[PDB]
Design an enzyme around this catalytic site. Structure first.
Site, PDB file in Angstrom:
ATOM      1  N   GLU D  39       0.825  -1.210   0.000  1.00 52.55           N
ATOM      2  CA  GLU D  39       0.000   0.000   0.000  1.00 52.55           C
ATOM      3  C   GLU D  39       0.861   1.263   0.000  1.00 52.55           C
ATOM      4  O   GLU D  39       0.648   2.190   0.783  1.00 52.55           O
ATOM      5  CB  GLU D  39      -0.983  -0.003   1.173  1.00 52.55           C
ATOM      6  CG  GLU D  39      -1.971  -1.154   1.130  1.00 52.55           C
ATOM      7  CD  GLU D  39      -2.323  -1.679   2.507  1.00 52.55           C
ATOM      8  OE1 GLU D  39      -2.034  -0.981   3.502  1.00 52.55           O
ATOM      9  OE2 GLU D  39      -2.886  -2.790   2.596  1.00 52.55           O
ATOM     10  N   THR D  44      -0.443   2.588  -8.504  1.00 50.52           N
ATOM     11  CA  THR D  44      -0.916   3.907  -8.910  1.00 50.52           C
ATOM     12  C   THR D  44       0.103   4.603  -9.799  1.00 50.52           C
ATOM     13  O   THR D  44      -0.270   5.309 -10.740  1.00 50.52           O
ATOM     14  CB  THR D  44      -1.227   4.760  -7.687  1.00 50.52           C
ATOM     15  OG1 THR D  44      -1.909   3.963  -6.711  1.00 50.52           O
ATOM     16  CG2 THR D  44      -2.111   5.927  -8.074  1.00 50.52           C
ATOM     17  N   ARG D 174      -7.975   0.329  -5.302  1.00 47.47           N
ATOM     18  CA  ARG D 174      -7.139  -0.642  -4.601  1.00 47.47           C
ATOM     19  C   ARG D 174      -7.521  -2.027  -5.110  1.00 47.47           C
ATOM     20  O   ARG D 174      -8.568  -2.569  -4.747  1.00 47.47           O
ATOM     21  CB  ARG D 174      -7.321  -0.506  -3.094  1.00 47.47           C
ATOM     22  CG  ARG D 174      -6.651  -1.582  -2.264  1.00 47.47           C
ATOM     23  CD  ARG D 174      -5.162  -1.634  -2.512  1.00 47.47           C
ATOM     24  NE  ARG D 174      -4.514  -2.635  -1.673  1.00 47.47           N
ATOM     25  CZ  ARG D 174      -3.306  -3.130  -1.900  1.00 47.47           C
ATOM     26  NH1 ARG D 174      -2.597  -2.767  -2.955  1.00 47.47           N
ATOM     27  NH2 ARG D 174      -2.801  -4.021  -1.052  1.00 47.47           N
ATOM     28  N   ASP D 196       6.593  -4.442 -11.681  1.00 47.32           N
ATOM     29  CA  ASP D 196       6.122  -4.374 -10.305  1.00 47.32           C
ATOM     30  C   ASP D 196       5.842  -5.785  -9.819  1.00 47.32           C
ATOM     31  O   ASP D 196       5.147  -6.548 -10.494  1.00 47.32           O
ATOM     32  CB  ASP D 196       4.861  -3.518 -10.193  1.00 47.32           C
ATOM     33  CG  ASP D 196       4.334  -3.449  -8.780  1.00 47.32           C
ATOM     34  OD1 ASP D 196       5.153  -3.435  -7.840  1.00 47.32           O
ATOM     35  OD2 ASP D 196       3.099  -3.417  -8.605  1.00 47.32           O
ATOM     36  N   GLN D 200       3.452 -10.460  -5.561  1.00 47.37           N
ATOM     37  CA  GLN D 200       4.227 -11.695  -5.558  1.00 47.37           C
ATOM     38  C   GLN D 200       4.355 -12.180  -4.120  1.00 47.37           C
ATOM     39  O   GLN D 200       5.267 -11.793  -3.390  1.00 47.37           O
ATOM     40  CB  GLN D 200       5.591 -11.453  -6.190  1.00 47.37           C
ATOM     41  CG  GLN D 200       6.459 -12.674  -6.345  1.00 47.37           C
ATOM     42  CD  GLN D 200       5.837 -13.691  -7.263  1.00 47.37           C
ATOM     43  OE1 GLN D 200       5.328 -14.715  -6.818  1.00 47.37           O
ATOM     44  NE2 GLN D 200       5.852 -13.403  -8.557  1.00 47.37           N
TER      45      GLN D 200
HETATM   46  N1  LIG Z   1      -4.752   9.926  -0.684  1.00 51.11           N
HETATM   47  C1  LIG Z   1      -3.825   9.334  -1.462  1.00 51.11           C
HETATM   48  N2  LIG Z   1      -3.923   8.036  -1.731  1.00 51.11           N
HETATM   49  C2  LIG Z   1      -2.984   7.419  -2.522  1.00 51.11           C
HETATM   50  C3  LIG Z   1      -1.896   8.151  -3.060  1.00 51.11           C
HETATM   51  N3  LIG Z   1      -1.157   7.317  -3.772  1.00 51.11           N
HETATM   52  C4  LIG Z   1      -1.743   6.106  -3.694  1.00 51.11           C
HETATM   53  N4  LIG Z   1      -2.829   6.142  -2.963  1.00 51.11           N
HETATM   54  C5  LIG Z   1      -3.697   5.033  -2.652  1.00 51.11           C
HETATM   55  O1  LIG Z   1      -2.963   4.070  -1.902  1.00 51.11           O
HETATM   56  C6  LIG Z   1      -3.611   2.790  -2.041  1.00 51.11           C
HETATM   57  C7  LIG Z   1      -2.577   1.717  -2.291  1.00 51.11           C
HETATM   58  O2  LIG Z   1      -2.000   1.960  -3.560  1.00 51.11           O
HETATM   59  P1  LIG Z   1      -1.459   0.687  -4.466  1.00 51.11           P
HETATM   60  O3  LIG Z   1      -2.609  -0.060  -4.989  1.00 51.11           O
HETATM   61  O4  LIG Z   1      -0.603   1.233  -5.629  1.00 51.11           O
HETATM   62  O5  LIG Z   1      -0.552  -0.263  -3.550  1.00 51.11           O
HETATM   63  P2  LIG Z   1       0.714  -1.224  -3.915  1.00 51.11           P
HETATM   64  O6  LIG Z   1       0.618  -1.598  -5.403  1.00 51.11           O
HETATM   65  O7  LIG Z   1       2.009  -0.431  -3.665  1.00 51.11           O
HETATM   66  S1  LIG Z   1       0.723  -2.788  -2.858  1.00 51.11           S
HETATM   67  C8  LIG Z   1      -4.452   3.029  -3.335  1.00 51.11           C
HETATM   68  O8  LIG Z   1      -5.842   2.897  -3.036  1.00 51.11           O
HETATM   69  C9  LIG Z   1      -4.135   4.447  -3.727  1.00 51.11           C
HETATM   70  O9  LIG Z   1      -5.329   5.093  -4.163  1.00 51.11           O
HETATM   71  C10 LIG Z   1      -1.789   9.582  -2.764  1.00 51.11           C
HETATM   72  O10 LIG Z   1      -0.920  10.305  -3.160  1.00 51.11           O
HETATM   73  N5  LIG Z   1      -2.788  10.066  -1.966  1.00 51.11           N
END
Ligand SMILES: Nc1nc2c(ncn2[C@@H]2O[C@H](COP(=O)(O)OP(O)(O)=S)[C@@H](O)[C@H]2O)c(=O)[nH]1
Ligand SMILES: C=CCN1CC[C@]23c4c5ccc(O)c4O[C@H]2C(=O)CC[C@@]3(O)[C@H]1C5
Lengths: 337, 287, 54, 350
Positions: D39, D44, D174, D196, D200
Site C-alpha cells: 500500500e 498507482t 485498490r 512491479d 508476488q
Molecule cells: N490519498 C492518497 N492516496 C494514494 C496516493 N497514492 C496512492 N494512494 C492510494 O494508496 C492505495 C494503495 O495503492 P497501491 O494499490 O498502488 O498499492 P501497492 O501496489 O504499492 S501494494 C491506493 O488505493 C491508492 O489510491 C496519494 O498520493 N494520496
C-alpha cells in the site's frame, strides 16, 4: 489446541528412530570394494551460442538431439544440438521465465516464470509457426519448475508453496499438492511417471503420488533451500542440491539419506543436479562457475566441467546418456561427452 | 670501451622477454578460457616476439666478439627473422585495429566474423604475406670474410641505384605509411563513434571488459609506435640525407636499436599489467 | 488454525506407518543397478570419436 | 559440405538475425523496477505512467473498473463498521445498529459490488453518523483502506445507476494482483519497460537476482505509514519495515550499478496527518518540531542514512502524490533527466 505439537514431535521422533532402526549400514561403507572411476574429464564438443541474457532453464528431448532453453531475454530457443542449429525461437508474452520443459512426445514446450502462468506452446502446428496453445493459470507465485507427464497432463511447482497437476485441454488444476511450508524450487518426475519429488525452501523434499494426490514421504537433512532435484534412473532414489553447498542422495525405500556429496573450499549453492544413464556419475551445477561430476557411490569428485563465465544454472543428461548439457548465466549452453 | 660491460643488460632483457613470451604461450593452450580472437592474436604477437628475442644472443655474439663463426645458414635465418618480427608485428596490430573496428563501430554482425576459424585463417595468411615479402632476404643473405671486419648484411644483384634504396623505401612505406595510417584513422572513427552520442544502458558487466580490452589494445599500439618510429626515421635520414658520421650519432643508433628491440619484452608485461585473466594464474604459480 | 495444526499431524500419522527396508539392502540394490547398466553409459566409458554424434 | 540440410542452416540464420534485431531493440531501452512495502502506491504509479504516456483510459477500461470501485467502497465501509467492535465506540443514533445489520445482510454476495438504491441509502445514512466519522478519524488504531475517505465522501455520485469512473476513480482503485505487472511506454525518444512485483506472495530472495541489470529502481515509500501500526505483534511499525526493506534493496549485491530513486509517496496525506499525529510515534528519538517540512526532511535523512554506499552511489529522493497527474509527471521528468544524464556519464572513452 496446544497439545497437538507435543504429539507431532513424538510422531517426528517415531519417524526418526524408525529411520535409525533400519540404518545398520551406509552407502559409503559397502562401496569400499568397488573400483573408483578415476578422473572423468569431458570436452566441450558443442557450444550452443545465440542467447543474449542469462539462461535460466533447459530441458533435453526423448530423441536426445533437440533441446529447449529459456533465457531472461524472453526467448525459448529450441535447438538442434547435433548440428548446432536453431529450429525455433519462441517469443514470450512475459520475459520473466524461470523454467522450461520439452514434452516426451516432442510436440509441446512448456515455459513459466514470474508471470505465474504456465504456457504450453504447440510445436506441430500443421499450418504455420509455433504459437501458444494453453495458458494454465491458478498459481499465486512464481513458477519454479514444470515437467510434462504426457501431451495432456503437466506437473508444475510454484512459489506459493504448492505443486499442481494440470489437464491441458480443460486448462484446470486436476490435482493440488500441498504440505510445503517453503517455496518449491524444483520437481523431478519418476521414470515410471507415477510419483514425483519436489524440494522446497523449508529444507525438505516431499514425495508425491500423481494419481492419488497426497504426500507419502518427507525427506529432511538439508540446512538451506533446496534448488535442485533429480530422480535416480531406476526410480527408487533421488539427489537434491541445496544452498548449503551439499548434495544428498535420498532413498525412497530406506526412507532416509544414504550419502552426502560435499568438499571443503566449496561455499556456493547448487543450482542443478542430474544423473547419468546408469546413475553412477552425479552431475551437479554450482555457482562457482563449475559443474562438479561426483561419484554417486564413493562420494568423491570424479570430474569437473569448467568453461562457463557465469553461474551454471541448469543441467541435462540425454535419454541415451551420451552428452551433458550445461546452461549458464553467460548466455552459453555447452555440450559435453 | 662499450662491449664488455654491455652484454649483461642485453642478456637479462632477452631472457626476461623469452620467459614472458613462453609464459604467455603456456597460458592459452589446453585451457578452458583464453580462446577469443584478440587473445590468439596476442598469442601470435607473443610468438613473433619470442622469435625476435631468441636471436638476440646470436646477434650479440658478433658484438661481444667481433667474429661470426656461426655459419652461412645461421646468418641466413637471423636477418630473415628480423624482417619477420618487424613486418608481422605492425600487421598483427593492423588486424587488431580492424578487429576492433568490426566490433564496436559495426553492429551486432560482429558475431559473424569473431569465430576463431576466420581469425586463424587471417593469422596464417598474414604470415604467408610476410614470408612472401621476406623471401628475398632468405635468397640474398651471405657472410663475407672481409679483411676489415666480418659481416653478413643483405646484398643485392645488379645494384646500380635501383636495388640498394628501393628496398629501404618499400619497407618504410609498407610498415608505417600503410598500416599506421589505417590504424590511426580507425581509432579516429572509434573515438568519434564512441563520443559523438551517448551509450545504451546494456550489460555494463560485459561492456567494461570490452572497454578494458580496447584500452589495452590502444596502449599496445601507442607503445609500439613510440618505440618503433625513431629507428625508422633514423634509417630514412641515413639513406636519404646521409649526414656525416659522429660519435653521438653512433650512440643514438645503438640506443634506438635497443629501443626498437625492447618492444618484444615490453608487450608481455604490458598486457598482463592490468588484466584479470592472467593475474590469478600468475599469483597461483608464483606461490 | 486448528485445521492446519491437524493436517500435519494426520500427514505424520500416514507417514510413519510405511514399511522401511534396511539401508544395506537398498544401497546394495543401487550398487547392483550401477554395475548392471554401466556398459551402456557413455559418460563412464567415453568412446573417443567412433559413435559419438558430437 | 554440399548437403541437403542447407534449409535448416538458413532457417537458423533467419532465427539469429531476428533475435539479434530483438536484442538490439532490448538493449536500447530503460528498465525501471518498482519496489516498496504494501500500500505504497506502486500500482498507482503504473496507472499514472499509463495515463501520461498513452491514451489514458477508454470508455471500456473505465467501465470495467466500476465493480472493483464498488467492492472497494463496500470493503472500506465494512472495515469502518467492524472497527467499532474492536474499538468500543457507541453509535450516534440507535438506528445505526439496524443499518449495520442491513449492510451485512445486503453484503452477503461475495462476487462483485452491487450498490443498489437500498445499499446506497444505508451507506449514506451510516456515513453521516458522528460515531462512524469518529471511528474513521481514529483509523491509525486499525487497518483501513487509504482511499476510504475519497470513495465514501463522493458516495452520492458513485452510487448513481449510470455512474462511470473518472481518471481519479480508476486511479484510486485498490486492486490485488498475483503476477508481475509490466507496462510499456515511450518518453524522450526512449522506450520504458516498468515492472512491479507487489502481488508476488513468495520469497523476495529467490527472484531479486532476476532484476540484476535494470536501469533504475523506484522505491515507493508511503510517508503516511509512520503513525500506523502492524496488527501482528503490536511492536513493529510499517515505516520501520519499509526502512529495513530499503536497507536490503539499496545495499543488495545485485544493484551495485542501479540508480535508486526514492518516491516518498502520499505526501498530501502526510501534510494533513503531521499537524495532529506527531512523528515521535515512529521515531522516538525525533527532537524537531511537528511540522511537515522538518518531518519530511527527517524521513528523507533517515532513508538516506540507511544507505551504506553514499560515497559511490547517490539516492535520488522525490516527494510524490501518486494520484496527482501533474506532480507525478514533473517527478518523472526529473527522474528521466537524471537517468539520461547518468547515461551520458556512462558514455566515456578509453
Ligand atoms: N490519498 C492518497 N492516496 C494514494 C496516493 N497514492 C496512492 N494512494 C492510494 O494508496 C492505495 C494503495 O495503492 P497501491 O494499490 O498502488 O498499492 P501497492 O501496489 O504499492 S501494494 C491506493 O488505493 C491508492 O489510491 C496519494 O498520493 N494520496
Ligand atoms: C630496431 C631493429 C630492427 N632492425 C631491422 C633491420 C634493419 C631495418 C630497420 C628498418 C628498415 C630496414 O629496411 C631495415 O634493415 C635493417 C637496416 O638497414 C638497419 C636498421 C635495422 O637493423 C633495424 C630497423
Amino acid at each position: 489446541l496446544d497439545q497437538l505439537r507435543q504429539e507431532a514431535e513424538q510422531l517426528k521422533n517415531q519417524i526418526r528412530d524408525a529411520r535409525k532402526a533400519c540404518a545398520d549400514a551406509t552407502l559409503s561403507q559397502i562401496t569400499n570394494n568397488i573400483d573408483p572411476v578415476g578422473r572423468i574429464q569431458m570436452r566441450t564438443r558443442r557450444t550452443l551460442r545465440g542467447h543474449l541474457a542469462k539462461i535460466y532453464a533447459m530441458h533435453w528431448g526423448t530423441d536426445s538431439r533437440l533441446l529447449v532453453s529459456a533465457s531472461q531475454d524472453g526467448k525459448l530457443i529450441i535447438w538442434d544440438s547435433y548440428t548446432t542449429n536453431k529450429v525455433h525461437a519462441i517469443p514470450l508474452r512475459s520475459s520473466w521465465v524461470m523454467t522450461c520443459a520439452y514434452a516426451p512426445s516432442g510436440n509441446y514446450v512448456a515455459c513459466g516464470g514470474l508471470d505465474n502462468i504456465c504456457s504450453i506452446y504447440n510445436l506441430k502446428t500443421r499450418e504455420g509457426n509455433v504459437r501458444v496453445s494453453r495458458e494454465l493459470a491458478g498459481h499465486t507465485g512464481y513458477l519454479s519448475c514444470c515437467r510434462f507427464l504426457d501431451d495432456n497432463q503437466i506437473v508444475t511447482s510454484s512459489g506459493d508453496t504448492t505443486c499442481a497437476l494440470w489437464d491441458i485441454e480443460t486448462g484446470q488444476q486436476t490435482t493440488t499438492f500441498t504440505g510445503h511450508t517453503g517455496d518449491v524450487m524444483s520437481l523431478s518426475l519418476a521414470p515410471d511417471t507415477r510419483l514425483f519429488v519436489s524440494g522446497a525452501c523449508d529444507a525438505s523434499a516431499k514425495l508425491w503420488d500423481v494419481r492419488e494426490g497426497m504426500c507419502r514421504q518427507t525427506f529432511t537433512g538439508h540446512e538451506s533451500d533446496i534448488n535442485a532435484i533429480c530422480f535416480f534412473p531406476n526410480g527408487n532414489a533421488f539427489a537434491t542440491g541445496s544452498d548449503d553447498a551439499t548434495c544428498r542422495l535420498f532413498d525412497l525405500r530406506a526412507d532416509q539419506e544414504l550419502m552426502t556429496y560435499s568438499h571443503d573450499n566449496i561455499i556456493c549453492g547448487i543450482t542443478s543436479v542430474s544423473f547419468s544413464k546408469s546413475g553412477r556419475l552425479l552431475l551437479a551445477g554450482y555457482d562457482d562457475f563449475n559443474c562438479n561430476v561426483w561419484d554417486a557411490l564413493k562420494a568423491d569428485r570424479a570430474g569437473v566441467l569448467a568453461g562457463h563465465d557465469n553461474r551454471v544454472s541448469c543441467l541435462g543428461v540425454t535419454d541415451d546418456g551420451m552428452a551433458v548439457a550445461t546452461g549458464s548465466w553467460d548466455s552459453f549452453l555447452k555440450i559435453w561427452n | 670501451i662499450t662491449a664488455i660491460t654491455i652484454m649483461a643488460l642485453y642478456s637479462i632483457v632477452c631472457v626476461v622477454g623469452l620467459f614472458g613470451n613462453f609464459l604467455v604461450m603456456y597460458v592459452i593452450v589446453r585451457y578452458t578460457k583464453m580462446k577469443t580472437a584478440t587473445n590468439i592474436y596476442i598469442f601470435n604477437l607473443a610468438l613473433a616476439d619470442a622469435l625476435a628475442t631468441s636471436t638476440l644472443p646470436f646477434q650479440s655474439v658478433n658484438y661481444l666478439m667481433g667474429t661470426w663463426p656461426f655459419g652461412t645458414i645461421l646468418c641466413k635465418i637471423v636477418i630473415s627473422i628480423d624482417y619477420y618480427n618487424m613486418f608481422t608485428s605492425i600487421f598483427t596490430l593492423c588486424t587488431m585495429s580492424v578487429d576492433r573496428y568490426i566490433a564496436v563501430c559495426h553492429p551486432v554482425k560482429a558475431l559473424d566474423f569473431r569465430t576463431p576459424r576466420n581469425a586463424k585463417i587471417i593469422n596464417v595468411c598474414n604470415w604467408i604475406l610476410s614470408s612472401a615479402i621476406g623471401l628475398p632476404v632468405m635468397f640474398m643473405a651471405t657472410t663475407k670474410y672481409r679483411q676489415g671486419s666480418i659481416d653478413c648484411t643483405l646484398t643485392f644483384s645488379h645494384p646500380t641505384w635501383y636495388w640498394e634504396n628501393l628496398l629501404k623505401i618499400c619497407v618504410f612505406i609498407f610498415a608505417f605509411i600503410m598500416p599506421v595510417l589505417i590504424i590511426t584513422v580507425c581509432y579516429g572513427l572509434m573515438i568519434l563513434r564512441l563520443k559523438s552520442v551517448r551509450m545504451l544502458s546494456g550489460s555494463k558487466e560485459k561492456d567494461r571488459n570490452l572497454r578494458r580490452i580496447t584500452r589495452m589494445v590502444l596502449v599496445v599500439v601507442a607503445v609500439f609506435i613510440v618505440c618503433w618510429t625513431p629507428i625508422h626515421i633514423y634509417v630514412i635520414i641515413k639513406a636519404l640525407v646521409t649526414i656525416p658520421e659522429t660519435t653521438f650519432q653512433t650512440v643514438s643508433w645503438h640506443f634506438c636499436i635497443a629501443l626498437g628491440y625492447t618492444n618484444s619484452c615490453l608487450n608481455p608485461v604490458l598486457y598482463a599489467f592490468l588484466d584479470e585473466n592472467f593475474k590469478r594464474c600468475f599469483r597461483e604459480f608464483c606461490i | 488454525s486448528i485445521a492446519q495444526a491437524r493436517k500435519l499431524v494426520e500427514q505424520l500419522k500416514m507417514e510413519a506407518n510405511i514399511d522401511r527396508i534396511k539401508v544395506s539392502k537398498a544401497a546394495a540394490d543401487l550398487m547392483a543397478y550401477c554395475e548392471a547398466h554401466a556398459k551402456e553409459d557413455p559418460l563412464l566409458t567415453p568412446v573417443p570419436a567412433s559413435e559419438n554424434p558430437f | 559440405l554440399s548437403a541437403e540440410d542447407k534449409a535448416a542452416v538458413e532457417r537458423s540464420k533467419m532465427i539469429d538475425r531476428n533475435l539479434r534485431e530483438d536484442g538490439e531493440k532490448a538493449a536500447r531501452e530503460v528498465k525501471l523496477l518498482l519496489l516498496g512495502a504494501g500500500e505504497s502506491g506502486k500500482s498507482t504509479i503504473v496507472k499514472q505512467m499509463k495515463i501520461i504516456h498513452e491514451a489514458g483510459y477508454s470508455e471500456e477500461e473505465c467501465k470495467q473498473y466500476k465493480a472493483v470501485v464498488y467492492s472497494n467502497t463496500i470493503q472500506s465501509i465494512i472495515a469502518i463498521i467492524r472497527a467499532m467492535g474492536r474499538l468500543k465506540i457507541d453509535f450516534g443514533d440507535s438506528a445505526r445498529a439496524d443499518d449495520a445489520r442491513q449492510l451485512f445482510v445486503l453484503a452477503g454476495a461475495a462476487e462483485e459490488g452491487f450498490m443498489t438504491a437500498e445499499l446506497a441509502g444505508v451507506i449514506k445514512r451510516l456515513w453521516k453518523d458522528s460515531g462512524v466519522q469518529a471511528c474513521f478519524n481514529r483509523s491509525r488504531e486499525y487497518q483501513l483502506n487509504d482511499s476510504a475517505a475519497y470513495y465514501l465522501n463522493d458516495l452520492d455520485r458513485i452510487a448513481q445507476p449510470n455512474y462511470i469512473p473518472t481518471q481519479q476513480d480508476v486511479l484510486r482503485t485498490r486492486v490485488k494482483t498475483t503476477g508481475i505487472v509490466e507496462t510499456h511506454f515511450t518518453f524522450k525518444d526512449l522506450h520504458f519497460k516498468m515492472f512491479d512485483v507487489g502481488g508476488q506472495r513468495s520469497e523476495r530472495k529467490k527472484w531479486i537476482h532476476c532484476f540484476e541489470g535494470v536501469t533504475a529502481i523506484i522505491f515507493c515509500v508511503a510517508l503516511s505509514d509512520y503513525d500506523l501500526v502492524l496488527a501482528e505483534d503490536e511492536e513493529m511499525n510499517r515505516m520501520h519495515e519499509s526502512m529495513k526493506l530499503f536497507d536490503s534493496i539499496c545495499n543488495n549485491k545485485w544493484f551495485t550499478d542501479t540508480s535508486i530513486i526514492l518516491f516518498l509517496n502520499k505526501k498530501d496525506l502526510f501534510e494533513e496527518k503531521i499537524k495532529k499525529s506527531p512523528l515521535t510515534i515512529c521515531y522516538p528519538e525525533y527532537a524537531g518540531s511537528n511540522t511537515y517540512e522538518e518531518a519530511a526532511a527527517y524521513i528523507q535523512c533517515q532513508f538516506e542514512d540507511l544507505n551504506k554506499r553514499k560515497d559511490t552511489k547517490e539516492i535520488y529522493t522525490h516527494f510524490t502524490c501518486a494520484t496527482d497527474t501533474k506532480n507525478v509527471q514533473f517527478v518523472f521528468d526529473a527522474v528521466t533527466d537524471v537517468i539520461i544524464k547518468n547515461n551520458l556519464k556512462d558514455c566515456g572513452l578509453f
